[PDB]
């Protein structure tokens, strides 16, 4: 998922769900 989070919605929703 887009590493800066918080440049793409979809990023940091599976980011939060991925790596956290």
Do not use: A, C, E, F
Request: proline share 20%.
């Amino acid at each position: 998922s887009p590493p800066p989070r918080g440049s793409s919605p979809g990023g940091d929703k599976l980011w939060q769900i991925y790596l956290n």
